[PDB]
Amino acid sequence: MISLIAALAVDRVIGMENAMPWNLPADLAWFKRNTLNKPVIMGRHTWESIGRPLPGRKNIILSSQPGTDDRVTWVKSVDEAIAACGDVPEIMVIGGGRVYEQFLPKAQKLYLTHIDAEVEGDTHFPDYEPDDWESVFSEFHDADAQNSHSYCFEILERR
Numbered sequence: 001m002i003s004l005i006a007a008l009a010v011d012r013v014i015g016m017e018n019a020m021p022w023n024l025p026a027d028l029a030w031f032k033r034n035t036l037n038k039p040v041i042m043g044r045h046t047w048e049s050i051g052r053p054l055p056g057r058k059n060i061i062l063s064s065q066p067g068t069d070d071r072v073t074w075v076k077s078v079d080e081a082i083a084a085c086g087d088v089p090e091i092m093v094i095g096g097g098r099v100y101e102q103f104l105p106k107a108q109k110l111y112l113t114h115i116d117a118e119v120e121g122d123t124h125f126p127d128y129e130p131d132d133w134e135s136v137f138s139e140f141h142d143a144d145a146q147n148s149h150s151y152c153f154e155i156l157e158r159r
Protein backbone atom coordinates (compact mmCIF):
# COMPACT_ATOMS: atom_id res chain seq x y z
CA MET A 1 0.00 0.00 0.00
CA ILE A 2 1.24 3.48 -0.91
CA SER A 3 0.37 6.52 1.22
CA LEU A 4 1.16 10.20 0.79
CA ILE A 5 1.83 12.50 3.77
CA ALA A 6 1.95 16.27 3.41
CA ALA A 7 1.21 19.55 5.19
CA LEU A 8 -0.72 22.10 3.13
CA ALA A 9 -1.16 25.79 3.75
CA VAL A 10 -3.90 27.84 2.09
CA ASP A 11 -4.32 27.14 -1.64
CA ARG A 12 -2.44 23.83 -1.27
CA VAL A 13 0.95 25.56 -0.90
CA ILE A 14 3.61 23.17 0.37
CA GLY A 15 6.87 25.05 -0.12
CA MET A 16 8.73 28.20 -1.03
CA GLU A 17 12.32 28.42 -2.30
CA ASN A 18 12.96 24.78 -1.35
CA ALA A 19 11.88 25.38 2.26
CA MET A 20 8.84 25.25 4.51
CA PRO A 21 8.62 28.73 6.10
CA TRP A 22 6.27 27.82 8.96
CA ASN A 23 7.08 26.06 12.24
CA LEU A 24 4.42 23.70 13.66
CA PRO A 25 5.99 21.27 16.15
CA ALA A 26 2.73 19.35 16.60
CA ASP A 27 2.66 18.59 12.89
CA LEU A 28 6.27 17.41 12.83
CA ALA A 29 5.40 15.09 15.73
CA TRP A 30 2.47 13.74 13.68
CA PHE A 31 4.80 13.25 10.71
CA LYS A 32 7.26 11.27 12.84
CA ARG A 33 4.59 9.08 14.43
CA ASN A 34 3.08 8.18 11.05
CA THR A 35 6.40 7.50 9.29
CA LEU A 36 8.62 5.86 11.91
CA ASN A 37 9.62 2.28 11.05
CA LYS A 38 8.37 2.64 7.47
CA PRO A 39 10.21 3.37 4.23
CA VAL A 40 9.99 6.95 3.03
CA ILE A 41 10.30 8.00 -0.62
CA MET A 42 11.30 11.56 -1.47
CA GLY A 43 12.52 13.53 -4.42
CA ARG A 44 16.00 15.01 -4.57
CA HIS A 45 14.88 18.58 -3.81
CA THR A 46 13.13 17.44 -0.63
CA TRP A 47 16.24 15.46 0.36
CA GLU A 48 18.29 18.66 0.05
CA SER A 49 15.63 20.58 2.02
CA ILE A 50 15.64 18.11 4.92
CA GLY A 51 19.43 17.98 4.87
CA ARG A 52 20.07 14.67 6.65
CA PRO A 53 18.68 11.11 6.80
CA LEU A 54 15.51 10.65 8.80
CA PRO A 55 16.33 8.20 11.61
CA GLY A 56 14.40 4.98 12.08
CA ARG A 57 13.18 4.92 8.47
CA LYS A 58 14.56 3.55 5.22
CA ASN A 59 15.24 6.72 3.18
CA ILE A 60 14.75 6.31 -0.58
CA ILE A 61 15.66 9.25 -2.85
CA LEU A 62 14.44 9.59 -6.43
CA SER A 63 16.94 11.22 -8.79
CA SER A 64 17.89 10.81 -12.42
CA GLN A 65 21.56 11.22 -11.50
CA PRO A 66 23.90 9.04 -9.42
CA GLY A 67 23.63 9.27 -5.67
CA THR A 68 26.06 11.27 -3.58
CA ASP A 69 25.56 9.76 -0.09
CA ASP A 70 25.52 6.07 0.85
CA ARG A 71 23.53 6.64 4.06
CA VAL A 72 20.38 6.55 1.89
CA THR A 73 19.13 4.53 -1.07
CA TRP A 74 19.12 6.15 -4.52
CA VAL A 75 16.73 5.06 -7.28
CA LYS A 76 16.06 6.29 -10.81
CA SER A 77 12.34 5.56 -11.36
CA VAL A 78 9.02 5.16 -9.55
CA ASP A 79 8.97 1.39 -10.10
CA GLU A 80 12.50 1.06 -8.69
CA ALA A 81 11.56 3.17 -5.66
CA ILE A 82 8.64 0.88 -4.89
CA ALA A 83 10.74 -2.27 -5.38
CA ALA A 84 13.47 -0.93 -3.08
CA CYS A 85 10.90 -0.81 -0.25
CA GLY A 86 10.44 -4.56 -0.27
CA ASP A 87 7.39 -6.34 1.10
CA VAL A 88 6.15 -3.88 3.71
CA PRO A 89 2.54 -3.03 4.61
CA GLU A 90 2.80 0.71 3.98
CA ILE A 91 5.15 2.89 1.92
CA MET A 92 5.19 6.59 2.83
CA VAL A 93 5.73 9.16 0.08
CA ILE A 94 6.94 12.39 1.64
CA GLY A 95 7.16 14.70 -1.39
CA GLY A 96 7.83 17.10 -2.87
CA GLY A 97 5.41 18.42 -5.48
CA ARG A 98 6.69 16.50 -8.51
CA VAL A 99 6.94 13.27 -6.52
CA TYR A 100 3.43 13.65 -5.06
CA GLU A 101 2.08 14.09 -8.60
CA GLN A 102 3.58 10.80 -9.72
CA PHE A 103 2.50 8.72 -6.74
CA LEU A 104 -1.03 10.09 -6.25
CA PRO A 105 -2.64 7.73 -8.83
CA LYS A 106 -1.04 4.77 -7.02
CA ALA A 107 -1.94 5.87 -3.49
CA GLN A 108 -4.63 4.36 -1.27
CA LYS A 109 -4.30 6.79 1.66
CA LEU A 110 -3.50 10.48 2.23
CA TYR A 111 -2.34 11.87 5.56
CA LEU A 112 -2.94 15.62 5.21
CA THR A 113 -2.40 18.48 7.63
CA HIS A 114 -4.36 21.58 6.70
CA ILE A 115 -2.65 24.65 8.16
CA ASP A 116 -4.58 27.91 8.55
CA ALA A 117 -1.77 30.07 7.18
CA GLU A 118 -1.36 32.16 4.03
CA VAL A 119 1.99 31.35 2.42
CA GLU A 120 3.50 32.70 -0.74
CA GLY A 121 4.79 29.52 -2.30
CA ASP A 122 6.20 28.09 -5.49
CA THR A 123 5.18 24.43 -4.93
CA HIS A 124 1.69 23.00 -4.52
CA PHE A 125 0.18 19.68 -3.58
CA PRO A 126 -1.54 18.09 -6.61
CA ASP A 127 -5.15 18.83 -7.32
CA TYR A 128 -6.87 15.66 -6.42
CA GLU A 129 -10.49 14.75 -7.11
CA PRO A 130 -12.54 14.98 -3.89
CA ASP A 131 -15.08 12.36 -5.01
CA ASP A 132 -12.37 9.69 -5.05
CA TRP A 133 -11.54 10.01 -1.33
CA GLU A 134 -13.33 9.27 1.94
CA SER A 135 -12.38 11.10 5.13
CA VAL A 136 -11.85 8.48 7.85
CA PHE A 137 -10.22 10.66 10.52
CA SER A 138 -10.08 14.36 11.28
CA GLU A 139 -8.86 16.27 14.32
CA PHE A 140 -8.88 20.07 14.62
CA HIS A 141 -6.50 22.00 16.86
CA ASP A 142 -6.50 25.69 17.74
CA ALA A 143 -3.23 27.58 17.82
CA ASP A 144 -1.33 27.55 21.13
CA ALA A 145 1.95 28.80 22.58
CA GLN A 146 3.96 26.22 20.59
CA ASN A 147 1.93 26.18 17.34
CA SER A 148 1.20 29.61 15.96
CA HIS A 149 -1.56 28.55 13.52
CA SER A 150 -4.62 26.36 13.78
CA TYR A 151 -4.39 23.06 11.97
CA CYS A 152 -6.47 20.00 11.01
CA PHE A 153 -5.09 16.46 10.76
CA GLU A 154 -7.03 14.38 8.21
CA ILE A 155 -6.67 10.85 6.87
CA LEU A 156 -8.39 10.04 3.56
CA GLU A 157 -8.76 6.65 1.98
CA ARG A 158 -9.44 6.02 -1.69
CA ARG A 159 -13.06 4.93 -2.14
Ligand SMILES: NC(=O)c1ccc[n+]([C@@H]2O[C@H](COP(=O)([O-])OP(=O)(O)OC[C@H]3O[C@@H](n4cnc5c(N)ncnc54)[C@H](OP(=O)(O)O)[C@@H]3O)[C@@H](O)[C@H]2O)c1
Pocket residue numbers: 005006007008013014015016017018019020042043044045046047049062063064065075076077078094095096097098099100102123
Ligand atom coordinates in the same frame (compact mmCIF):
# COMPACT_ATOMS: atom_id res chain seq x y z
N1 LIG B 1 4.68 20.70 3.18
C1 LIG B 1 5.05 19.46 2.85
O1 LIG B 1 4.39 18.52 3.23
C2 LIG B 1 6.22 19.22 2.00
C3 LIG B 1 6.66 17.92 1.79
C4 LIG B 1 7.74 17.70 0.97
C5 LIG B 1 8.35 18.77 0.34
N2 LIG B 1 7.90 20.00 0.53
C6 LIG B 1 8.53 21.13 -0.17
O2 LIG B 1 8.43 20.78 -1.55
C7 LIG B 1 9.49 21.47 -2.29
C8 LIG B 1 10.26 20.46 -3.13
O3 LIG B 1 9.34 19.94 -4.13
P1 LIG B 1 9.73 19.86 -5.68
O4 LIG B 1 8.47 19.52 -6.45
O5 LIG B 1 10.53 21.07 -6.07
O6 LIG B 1 10.76 18.63 -5.75
P2 LIG B 1 10.76 17.07 -5.34
O7 LIG B 1 9.54 16.44 -5.81
O8 LIG B 1 11.26 16.97 -3.89
O9 LIG B 1 12.05 16.60 -6.15
C9 LIG B 1 12.05 16.59 -7.59
C10 LIG B 1 13.31 15.88 -8.05
O10 LIG B 1 13.18 14.49 -7.74
C11 LIG B 1 13.71 13.68 -8.79
N3 LIG B 1 12.63 12.90 -9.37
C12 LIG B 1 11.30 13.06 -9.25
N4 LIG B 1 10.66 12.13 -9.92
C13 LIG B 1 11.60 11.32 -10.51
C14 LIG B 1 11.56 10.17 -11.31
N5 LIG B 1 10.37 9.61 -11.72
N6 LIG B 1 12.72 9.64 -11.68
C15 LIG B 1 13.85 10.18 -11.30
N7 LIG B 1 14.00 11.24 -10.54
C16 LIG B 1 12.86 11.81 -10.15
C17 LIG B 1 14.37 14.66 -9.78
O11 LIG B 1 15.71 14.81 -9.32
P3 LIG B 1 16.91 15.11 -10.35
O12 LIG B 1 16.78 16.59 -10.85
O13 LIG B 1 18.14 14.85 -9.56
O14 LIG B 1 16.73 14.01 -11.48
C18 LIG B 1 13.50 15.91 -9.56
O15 LIG B 1 14.15 17.11 -9.97
C19 LIG B 1 10.32 22.19 -1.21
O16 LIG B 1 9.81 23.53 -1.08
C20 LIG B 1 10.00 21.38 0.05
O17 LIG B 1 10.17 22.15 1.22
C21 LIG B 1 6.86 20.25 1.32
Ligand SMILES: Nc1nc(=O)c2nc(CNc3ccc(C(=O)N[C@@H](CCC(=O)O)C(=O)O)cc3)cnc2[nH]1
Pocket residue numbers: 005006007025027028029030031032046050054055094095112113
Ligand atom coordinates in the same frame (compact mmCIF):
# COMPACT_ATOMS: atom_id res chain seq x y z
N1 LIG C 1 2.48 16.79 7.86
C1 LIG C 1 3.70 16.93 7.32
N2 LIG C 1 4.48 17.84 7.89
C2 LIG C 1 5.71 18.10 7.46
O1 LIG C 1 6.43 18.94 8.01
C3 LIG C 1 6.17 17.31 6.33
N3 LIG C 1 7.40 17.51 5.85
C4 LIG C 1 7.78 16.78 4.84
C5 LIG C 1 9.17 16.97 4.27
N4 LIG C 1 10.08 17.74 5.13
C6 LIG C 1 10.49 17.44 6.42
C7 LIG C 1 11.21 18.36 7.17
C8 LIG C 1 11.61 18.04 8.44
C9 LIG C 1 11.32 16.80 9.03
C10 LIG C 1 11.78 16.48 10.40
O2 LIG C 1 12.63 17.15 10.96
N5 LIG C 1 11.23 15.41 11.00
C11 LIG C 1 11.59 14.93 12.34
C12 LIG C 1 10.71 15.62 13.40
C13 LIG C 1 10.44 14.81 14.65
C14 LIG C 1 9.63 15.65 15.61
O3 LIG C 1 9.58 16.84 15.46
O4 LIG C 1 8.97 15.07 16.62
C15 LIG C 1 11.38 13.45 12.19
O5 LIG C 1 12.17 12.62 12.85
O6 LIG C 1 10.51 12.99 11.47
C16 LIG C 1 10.61 15.88 8.26
C17 LIG C 1 10.20 16.20 6.99
C18 LIG C 1 6.91 15.84 4.27
N6 LIG C 1 5.70 15.63 4.73
C19 LIG C 1 5.29 16.36 5.76
N7 LIG C 1 4.03 16.19 6.29
Ligand SMILES: [Mn+2]
Pocket residue numbers: 077079
Ligand atom coordinates in the same frame (compact mmCIF):
# COMPACT_ATOMS: atom_id res chain seq x y z
MN1 LIG D 1 10.91 1.51 -15.99
Ligand SMILES: [Mn+2]
Pocket residue numbers: 086087
Ligand atom coordinates in the same frame (compact mmCIF):
# COMPACT_ATOMS: atom_id res chain seq x y z
MN1 LIG E 1 7.34 -8.13 -3.38
Ligand SMILES: [Mn+2]
Pocket residue numbers: 116117118148149150
Ligand atom coordinates in the same frame (compact mmCIF):
# COMPACT_ATOMS: atom_id res chain seq x y z
MN1 LIG F 1 -2.84 31.47 10.60
